[PDB]
Structures are given as C-alpha cells and as structure tokens.
Amino acid sequence: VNSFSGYLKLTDNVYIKNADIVEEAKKVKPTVVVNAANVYLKHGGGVAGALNKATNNAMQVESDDYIATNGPLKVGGSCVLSGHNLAKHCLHVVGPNVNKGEDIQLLKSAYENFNQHEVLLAPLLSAGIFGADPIHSLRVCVDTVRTNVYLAVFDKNLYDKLVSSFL
Numbered sequence: 001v002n003s004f005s006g007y008l009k010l011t012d013n014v015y016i017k018n019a020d021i022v023e024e025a026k027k028v029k030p031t032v033v034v035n036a037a038n039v040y041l042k043h044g045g046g047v048a049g050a051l052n053k054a055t056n057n058a059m060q061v062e063s064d065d066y067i068a069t070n071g072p073l074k075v076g077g078s079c080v081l082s083g084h085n086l087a088k089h090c091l092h093v094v095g096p097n098v099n100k101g102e103d104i105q106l107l108k109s110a111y112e113n114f115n116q117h118e119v120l121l122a123p124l125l126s127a128g129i130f131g132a133d134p135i136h137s138l139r140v141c142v143d144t145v146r147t148n149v150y151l152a153v154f155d156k157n158l159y160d161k162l163v164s165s166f167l
C-alpha cells in the first residue's frame with residue numbers, strides 16, 4: 001500500500017490523476033518526484049519552473065552546482081538530485097523538446113529512466129510546452145515504464161481527453 005489517493009488505474013503499474021504535480025508532491029512527499037527538465041537544468045517554466053518556485057529556488061541553486069561540475073545532461077537522460085521540501089529525491093528527466101527540433105524516439109529513452117525507481121510521482125514527458133502530443137507520451141509511458149508511476153496531469157480538459165482516448 002502507498003499514500004497516493006484519487007488516481008484512476010490505467011494498467012497494472014500506471015495510474016493517472018487530474019492534479020498539479022507541485023500540489024501532489026507537497027501532500028504525498030513521495031520518495032521520487034520527476035521533473036520535466038532540460039539538459040541545462042534551467043527550471044524556467046512548466047513543471048520545472050513550478051517545482052523550482054515551490055522550493056524557493058533551492059532546486060535551481062543545487063542544479064547550477066550540478067551542471068558546473070558535470071556539464072549538461074543528454075536528451076533522454078536524467079540525474080537524481082534532492083527533492084527539497086517536495087520529495088526525498090527529484091529525478092530530473094530530459095524528454096525531447098519538439099519546439100527545439102529533438103527526435104521524438106528519444107521519449108522512450110527518457111521514460112526508461114523511471115525503471116530505476118520502484119515508485120514515482122511524474123508528469124507526462126515531452127507534453128505541454130515541450131511540443132509533443134500528450135496522448136503519445138502516455139502511450140510511450142505505459143509501454144516503457146514497468147515500475148509504479150503516478151501521473152499528475154495539471155490541465156483539466158487534457159486529463160479527460162487522455163482517459164477517454166486511452167486504449
């Protein structure tokens with residue numbers, strides 16, 4: 001048993017809810033919250049800016065030190081950093097950004113990072129401002145992630161569309 005509440009079950013291991021990933025993290029304090037990161041860990045908007053704002057910019061300070069030491073992530077890659085006040089850990093995952101021209105095939109590689117963690121609270125990668133089709137992102141998630149993933153979809157008519165259209 002875990003603390004996640006109000007989720008619709010899509011598959012054996014994937015669950016979905018209409019919720020802000022920030023509000024959910026503050027309530028649950030999950031072991032792992034996933035950030036929709038970029039390779040520079042510049043947390044300006046979408047999930048990264050909201051998560052970072054909720055940490056009072058401590059996520060950005062930590063991220064800047066990570067990049068200064070290690071250099072940028074790969075598209076499709078990830079790193080584990082602190083979850084600050086939101087979670088034990090934050091898994092920063094870089095999905096491809098369609099609005100920058102990145103290969104959508106890298107979305108599967110991005111979701112494979114989730115399999116290193118038994119349970120995660122996550123957004124849909126590459127959806128929203130990243131330019132990918134969220135219906136596609138949910139299909140890749142279900143077909144790639146084998147660990148238990150709780151998807152928070154912030155946008156209301158998108159949640160309803162994802163559920164209604166789910167195969």
Ligand SMILES: Nc1ncn(C[C@H]2CCCO2)c2ncnc1-2
Pocket residue numbers: 019020021022046047050123124127128129152153154155158
């Ligand atoms: N605070 C937040 N900002 C942005 N997104 C992404 C967009 C695209 C899907 C619906 O929301 C979030 N997902 C969960 N929480 C989110």
